[PDB]
Amino acid sequence: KYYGNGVSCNKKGCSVDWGKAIGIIGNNAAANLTTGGKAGWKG
Numbered sequence: 016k017y018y019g020n021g022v023s024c025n026k027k028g029c030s031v032d033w034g035k036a037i038g039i040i041g042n043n044a045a046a047n048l049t050t051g052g053k054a055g056w057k058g
Contacts, residue, residue, distance in 0.1 A: 016024050020036030023029065046052055 016022065016029070018031070018036070020031075020039060022031040022036075024031070046054075
């Protein structure tokens with residue numbers, strides 16, 4: 016599985032680096048708080 020935040024897993028095992036992804040979410044939500052931008056998301 017590949018989420019897209021630095022994750023790796025095929026057969027041997029997984030090693031999702033749960034450290035950098037957290038920094039990407041903080042900004043993602045920050046855009047919803049400021050409400051200063053448009054977006055055609057699914058919703």
